[PDB]
Enzyme design. Sequence first.
Site, PDB file in Angstrom:
ATOM      1  N   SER A 144      43.735  34.624  55.964  1.00 21.84           N
ATOM      2  CA  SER A 144      44.384  34.763  54.662  1.00 21.84           C
ATOM      3  C   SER A 144      43.385  35.089  53.547  1.00 21.84           C
ATOM      4  O   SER A 144      42.190  34.841  53.671  1.00 21.84           O
ATOM      5  CB  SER A 144      45.169  33.487  54.327  1.00 21.84           C
ATOM      6  OG  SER A 144      44.292  32.385  54.194  1.00 21.84           O
ATOM      7  N   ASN A 145      43.891  35.651  52.455  1.00 19.84           N
ATOM      8  CA  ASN A 145      43.066  35.985  51.301  1.00 19.84           C
ATOM      9  C   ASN A 145      42.442  34.723  50.691  1.00 19.84           C
ATOM     10  O   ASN A 145      43.012  33.630  50.786  1.00 19.84           O
ATOM     11  CB  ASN A 145      43.924  36.723  50.273  1.00 19.84           C
ATOM     12  CG  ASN A 145      43.125  37.249  49.107  1.00 19.84           C
ATOM     13  OD1 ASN A 145      42.542  38.329  49.180  1.00 19.84           O
ATOM     14  ND2 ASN A 145      43.100  36.494  48.014  1.00 19.84           N
ATOM     15  N   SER A 146      41.274  34.860  50.067  1.00 20.70           N
ATOM     16  CA  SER A 146      40.599  33.700  49.478  1.00 20.70           C
ATOM     17  C   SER A 146      41.413  33.019  48.364  1.00 20.70           C
ATOM     18  O   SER A 146      41.219  31.836  48.063  1.00 20.70           O
ATOM     19  CB  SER A 146      39.191  34.071  49.004  1.00 20.70           C
ATOM     20  OG  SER A 146      39.226  35.071  48.007  1.00 20.70           O
ATOM     21  N   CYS A 147      42.349  33.758  47.776  1.00 22.89           N
ATOM     22  CA  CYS A 147      43.241  33.174  46.776  1.00 22.89           C
ATOM     23  C   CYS A 147      44.100  32.020  47.332  1.00 22.89           C
ATOM     24  O   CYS A 147      44.583  31.172  46.575  1.00 22.89           O
ATOM     25  CB  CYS A 147      44.125  34.249  46.124  1.00 22.89           C
ATOM     26  SG  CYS A 147      45.584  34.800  47.061  1.00 22.89           S
TER      27      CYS A 147
END
Lengths: 465, 465
Positions: B191-194
């Site tokens: 998943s994205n770091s966000c």
Amino acid sequence: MDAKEFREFGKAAIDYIADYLENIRDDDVLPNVEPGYLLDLLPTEMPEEPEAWKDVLGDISRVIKPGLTHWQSPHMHAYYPTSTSYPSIVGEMLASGFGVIGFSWICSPACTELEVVVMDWLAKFLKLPAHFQHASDGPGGGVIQGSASEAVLVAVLAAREQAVANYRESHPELSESEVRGRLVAYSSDQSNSCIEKAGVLAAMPIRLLPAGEDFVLRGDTLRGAIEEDVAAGRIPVICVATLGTTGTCAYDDIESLSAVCEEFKVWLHVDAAYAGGAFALEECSDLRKGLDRVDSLNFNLHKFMLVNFDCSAMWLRDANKVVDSFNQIPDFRHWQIPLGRRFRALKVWITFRTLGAEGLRNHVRKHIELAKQFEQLVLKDSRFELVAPRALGLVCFRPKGDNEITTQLLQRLMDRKKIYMVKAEHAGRQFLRFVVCGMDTKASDIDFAWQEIESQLTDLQAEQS
Amino acid sequence: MDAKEFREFGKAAIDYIADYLENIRDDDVLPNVEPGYLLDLLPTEMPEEPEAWKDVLGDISRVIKPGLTHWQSPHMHAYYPTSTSYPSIVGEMLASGFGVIGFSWICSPACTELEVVVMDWLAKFLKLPAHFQHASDGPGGGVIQGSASEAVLVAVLAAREQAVANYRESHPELSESEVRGRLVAYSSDQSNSCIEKAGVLAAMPIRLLPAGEDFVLRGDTLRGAIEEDVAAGRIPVICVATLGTTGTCAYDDIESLSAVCEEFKVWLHVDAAYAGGAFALEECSDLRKGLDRVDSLNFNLHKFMLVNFDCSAMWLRDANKVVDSFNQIPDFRHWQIPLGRRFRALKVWITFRTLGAEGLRNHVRKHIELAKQFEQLVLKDSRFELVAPRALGLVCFRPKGDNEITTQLLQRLMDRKKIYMVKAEHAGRQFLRFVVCGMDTKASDIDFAWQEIESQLTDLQAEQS
């Protein structure tokens, strides 16, 4: 759409905007349309083939404008201003043209460096403590955020993380659950609703402590609450003070709150969203008392600086405290909630340069002058009274008598749509807020607003039967 | 600055942008400047008197542009796109001209209603379930947010509040501290770091569960983790699935995750930030499996829709769940973190209308076609291999041999600055990501990128001594 069609569309849009803004007081500030009007005017699917930009542009005036409250109007008196400026509109458009995102230096070096430079410019212009400058020795610096709500949220979350790290490291027998469940934070009962919402979002209680009769929160109140808490085994996290309250433009007492806060190691954030602009003025110097002692501060450039909406400045005394919680050229994605960032410094820079510090100062002083003119009108009229001392661009006042006279007067003004004000209430007493909002606001505009108000009260009272 | 000076400044700025964009591949995509270059070029105070807009505009080219990485260039291959469009730039400028804020309907009715209308338009264009439409019966609807980071944050915070309300109401003997300290949430390790940062900001653990070798997170993995948690007396809150992972554009399996999530009453949010665009295409229909079963979904219009940066769409199956946590025409300030909101629907509307759904679909299909062309180049060359199957506008590939060949090749490309790519790594193996980003991207641009890459590897290997 190719470039020529863009030059033509854009040029006509520039004309459209210039002529919307120059001629704005000719239109009713408040809209006459009912909820749902637009839904009814517009198709329910996007067109399959491309529409002509002339048709779209004509639709702006036909179906969009009637559904606008005109914030840029000199006749908008309702809330603290957004008033944009011509150069700001051009700058934002330029930024959109580059369409760059600054999530790291190499994503574009200018994004970040220009932010550093205009935040320092602004800090010097606002006569802020040196340590808030990037250029200064020390970890201090400013960063452009989306809104004051976001800046307050950042400060609260950062303070919560620093607290639960400093504590849990001090007492590792305690679980994160226990520590986090013991956190408490403070603000004024006159603070903006964004404080409260930040409490909800941060999962931390924010006690809205009673301000005095003068709407000012004081060090002794905070001390009392913090001692009440600490005694009970709770961990005080952050105090959010307000310079320029929404209701009366009241000023919390930052010196006493500061002494208290340093005592208990409490983060102190100052929400200066509106009144920050007046920091630039020598005759307003009292507003800066205690600023050398706070942790972070926000001011909305759209409110007092003629940079269009978006554009809140947040300075931190020590940025590490944010960066350590969320994770020399700063890496700004760490000073913020989201990851990517828009190039907002561009419009700020263009506005500062084309306006000049002289223009900025004149702009703030002009709002103060117009409010002073208004207050004089309220004072001369035997039928109206001041509810609070005039502050910056805001005058709080009411027709004398029962609250219902205020309500009826406001309803009349709303229905007429020549000027826009809202009601407020304190200790049972309702009043009207008059704020000067205009890009173009002139003395005659103040006279216009007063005539409208004074007229409507005359007719209201001449009808009573 | 008065109106005439604005018409002239703005018109020259329109010319400046049109000519920057039409001619963009003539400039190096990556900048040649060192950190600190801008700080050195610019004064340390804002000018006291106003500067001429011609001087400022000339400075854009002199001191700003050299510090830009050009995101709008066909030669930008590094990350998922921002590519804006001409109409989008005009729309945003128009919005800036009105300078209106939509924190409530009356603050401007058009702000809100137009948002409702374009979010419905987009939901129909993306072949999304009907219940995501405002017009539909039911509490579902979309809202424009600032970024995908914010949309993910909103969904996580909302799920956390709904969880601690549904639980604590179910078991009032438990204190908020205990419940909140027992919350757990899930995502992919791809998943994205966000997602991670949202975990930090939400004060809730987000387990990044291992995806398969194929980078896909699956229902059985989630079930396993949730049973491991529940058994331990922990409360599962939300799963954040990804359609279109940053690394390979992998697709989590939403059907199995969905079944699992409904089982355990877990909120399921889908981050479709990039790949959402392809929902519009019949040949991509598999990407929509399970969408009728999720709680919320985000897609970034700037990434695939040619609406300039900012502009993330978030649809909720039941908006009450957000509104109840943070606090017929929707009141959007309740669907979001901040309080005020920009009028972002305007540029969206203008872009949808002037492009047409046909233009939008062609745009996505054109990216798919260009990536397919690139992949063919990689496949034909005996010295390169594919690391993942081609997806949408992204091809992952590396020169055959040790990781250091990849590193050296990338360094050569960086130093040349003709095209911009970044490295990635999975299971020890490093690779290059090629993403098609261009507003204007053509087959010859793909040929250009390949020639550059292929050349540099030839020289790299012809040097080894």
